[PDB]
């Protein structure tokens, strides 16, 4: 374990667990969260919240005294996070959301408006619109392109297409999509609500070509020039072809990320390979299968990973770096692949610690510093160090369960 | 129980029994915000319910506040005269000896200032050494600070001789070892525990700090509150918490690994536990805050023992040797208050 965790509550210091300027806009978070570089040099962070129906924005260099902004949705999206996009085009943030109901809505939200002490917003800061039936045909994947133009996914393995004329409105461009043909086939059906091959992962290379990542982990790639299928690729007939159990992957997630010219692809085989090729004209050319190290049966979910240039490790020879972090319940675990060389052959794996020093040394009974005795000297122990938000949350989290502190050195209550 | 008011002006910070000399066992010092009072508990006729009172003898003046008060073996009675030996502590911070003869003062040693602690000053205890001849040697005083020290301060034929020991944290309670003046154990606030032999590094030291089962949690700040020897050849050592939490250690066989029993008062323990002096499985620890006390049995044979609930603070109580009696010291009085059980 070369790494070790440093948690950052951003309201710590303060009394207050609430910014006192948070402002709500309407429109007529505890599921997703990211952040995100503005051209101010400042991070913006926002969260979509369990329903998908408020998002959130505050700036992560001055939590308390800056504006964070709930922005508070008429519906929930259609397929939360995933059928949501945010991008700064030009001094504004954009942020497109297609909601359950078919509506595709836009935010504007001035760079300004995002540090400015305001509590109001003036213009257009949102439009509704309707440019596809999606009562039909259901999406359940929204994926940037560019400020006119980004594409749709079909949860029945079709593509849209959705370019922007003037600054509002959108229209659908149809992709040619003879997959479907399958259905000629006797295994497969139009009607079923299995053999689907939707998109579950997707990135833009070199502004023209879209690479897609199926259920069954096939690599297809969409030149944007032509709208066409250029390349086929079935991931998973290169590795030892077991016929037991591929899980076509049953959900939207992180299964790829290219830095360069490179590009890893997260396949499930016990949850365990990263393959790693090269994209070259266009050509994508097989590396190398690398698996992973993960025990205790491997039931570890992909939560991000982010391939990018090497780190400063406790080995010179490197090559690149992946970011990985998988999840299991709320435990995580972050691990970085060492690539030593061209050839994606030779690695290492570098762990590190999931619980930070406070943590462990509280759960493992090694913290010799806090002071002993009384059970008020425990609340300001307990309420130094987890905060106000969190102790504020516990203390509401007790009463709701109808437990409440009997008297000054009820002992009984400070160990719940 | 029967209960014997202090003097109107009289605020006491402290209470303890002679036990620690046979001759005086009877003999009971409240130290004050103007010196120490002794009492003597006699058996009346009574009704044989409480068949024990208590008979107000005197009260020695020293002008200044009493936080800590420890007989000394030296204590004799005489026809009547009673020869006393008190190590205290006082408002301005010193370590005292009051050798006494009734409520007069024939004597005082006097340690502070800077060869004296550099801080207040939590816990003081004596024990009279004697050599192989068995005139009185030397009488010793232990005590531990603020200032992370421990002071042993032994008064010989030749004259005092003055040691100083660092502690990694401020002295929270020291006592000698029974039957054996050679060991003695020293606390720190932080929940070290050590066992020293200062005739002599310092011989071992255990810790309740990470012991704590926290099947409960202890909390957050669980800061020692008092530790003990048990039995009469100090075969055991004692530990409690603020938090109520307490601990159980022997000291004989064979080879050890962990505490030898653990568990946890009703309530919090600002003063500490007093063990009995006849049961060691048994020991008492106060509510101190709303006037609760609770007995406790290590061995589990206690199912929460609250003998005493007064409707008032308690500022300090301790055991009569006899182990039925108990002397309790509110914030305006002494109550003698006798659990039929254990006569």
């Known amino acids: 374990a070369c790494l070790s965790r440093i948690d950052a509550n951003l309201l710590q210091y303060y009394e207050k667990p609430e910014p006192n300027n948070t402002v709500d806009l309407y429109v007529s978070g505890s599921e997703y969260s990211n952040c995100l570089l503005l051209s101010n040099s400042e991070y913006i962070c926002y969260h979509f919240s369990s ?14 005294h800056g504006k964070t902004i709930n922005i508070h949705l008429p519906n929930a999206s259609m397929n939360q996070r995933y059928t949501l996009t945010i991008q700064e085009v030009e001094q504004q943030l954009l942020v497109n959301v297609i909601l359950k109901d078919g509506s595709f809505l836009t935010l504007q939200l001035p760079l300004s408006f995002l ?58 461009l149809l992709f040619n999509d003879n997959s479907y043909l399958k259905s000629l086939t006797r295994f497969f059906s139009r009607s079923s609500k299995s053999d689907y091959d939707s998109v579950i992962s997707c990135k833009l290379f070199h502004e023209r070509y879209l690479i897609v990542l199926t259920q069954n982990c096939h690599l297809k790639i969409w030149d944007l020039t032509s709208f066409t299928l250029i390349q086929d690729y079935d991931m998973v007939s290169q590795s030892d072809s077991d016929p037991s159990h591929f899980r076509k992957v049953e959900a939207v997630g992180e299964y790829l990320s290219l830095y360069n010219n490179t590009l890893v692809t997260l396949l499930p085989l016990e949850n365990g390979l990263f393959q790693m090729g090269t ?14 190290n993960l025990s205790a049966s491997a039931i570890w979910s992909i939560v991000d990973l982010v391939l990018t240039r090497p ?37 290492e794996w570098i762990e590190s610690v999931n619980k930070s020093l406070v943590d462990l040394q509280s759960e493992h009974d090694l913290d010799i510093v806090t002071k002993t005795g009384d059970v008020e000297r425990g609340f300001c122990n307990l309420k130094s160090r987890y905060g106000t938000q969190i102790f504020e949350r516990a203390q509401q989290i007790l009463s709701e369960n109808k437990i409440i502190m009997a008297h000054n050195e009820d002992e009984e209550y400070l160990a719940n | 129980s029967n209960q014997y008011q202090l003097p109107l002006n009289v605020r006491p910070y402290t209470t303890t029994w002679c036990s620690q000399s046979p001759s005086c066992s009877n003999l009971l010092a409240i130290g004050h915000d103007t010196g120490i ?39 004799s009675y005489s026809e009547p005269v009673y020869s006393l030996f008190l190590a205290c502590v006082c408002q301005d911070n010193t370590v005292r000896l009051i050798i006494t003869k009734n409520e007069t003062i024939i004597t005082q040693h006097v340690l502070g200032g800077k060869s004296g602690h550099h801080n207040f000053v939590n816990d003081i205890d004596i024990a009279d050494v004697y050599s192989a001849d068995n005139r009185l040697a030397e009488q010793v005083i232990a005590s531990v600070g603020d200032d992370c020290t421990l002071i042993i301060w032994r008064l010989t034929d030749e004259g005092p001789i003055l040691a100083g020991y660092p502690l990694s944290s401020p002295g929270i309670s020291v006592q000698f070892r029974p039957s054996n003046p050679n060991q003695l154990i020293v606390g720190e606030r932080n929940g070290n525990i050590r066992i020293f032999d200062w005739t002599l590094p310092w011989l071992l030291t255990l810790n309740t700090l990470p012991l704590v089962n926290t099947c409960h949690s202890s ?27 307490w601990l159980r250690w022997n000291l004989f066989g064979p080879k050890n690994l962990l505490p030898n029993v653990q568990g946890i008062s009703l309530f919090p323990s600002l003063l500490g536990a007093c063990p009995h002096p006849r049961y060691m499985d048994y020991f008492a620890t106060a509510h101190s805050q709303h006037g609760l006390i609770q007995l406790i049995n290590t061995y589990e044979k206690d199912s929460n023992s609250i003998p005493i609930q007064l409707g008032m603070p308690i500022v300090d109580f301790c055991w009569h040797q006899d182990g039925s009696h108990l002397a309790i010291a509110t914030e305006g009085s002494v109550l003698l208050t006798r659990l039929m059980g254990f006569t």
């Open chain 1, 279 to 292: 994209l070259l004209v266009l050509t994508y050319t097989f590396q190398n299968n690398i698996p992973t």
């Open chain 2, 219 to 245: 909390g957050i700040a669980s800061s020692l509150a008092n530790v003990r020897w048990i039995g009469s050849d100090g075969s055991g050592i004692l530990a409690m918490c603020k938090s109520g939490a």
């Open chain 2, 37 to 75: 009072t002794i009492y003597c508990a006699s058996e009346e006729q009574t009704p044989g319910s409480t068949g024990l009172t208590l008979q107000e003898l005197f009260t020695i003046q020293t002008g200044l506040p009493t936080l800590h008060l420890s007989f000394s073996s030296s204590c």
């Open chain 1, 311 to 347: 780190l400063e490790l406790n080995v010179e020879a490197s090559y690149l770096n992946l970011i990985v972090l998988w999840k299991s319940g709320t435990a995580s675990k972050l691990q970085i692949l060492n690539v030593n060389d061209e050839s994606f052959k030779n690695y």
């Open chain 1, 51 to 64: 329903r998908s129906t408020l998002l959130t924005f505050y700036p992560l260099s001055d939590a308390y």
């Open chain 1, 115 to 172: 540090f400015s002490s305001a509590n109001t917003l003036n213009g257009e800061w949102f439009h509704l619109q309707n440019p596809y039936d999606f009562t039909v045909r259901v999406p359940h994947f929204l994926f940037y392109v560019s400020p006119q133009f980004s594409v749709v996914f079909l949860e029945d393995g079709g593509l849209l297409g959705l370019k922007k004329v003037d600054g509002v409105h959108y229209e659908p």
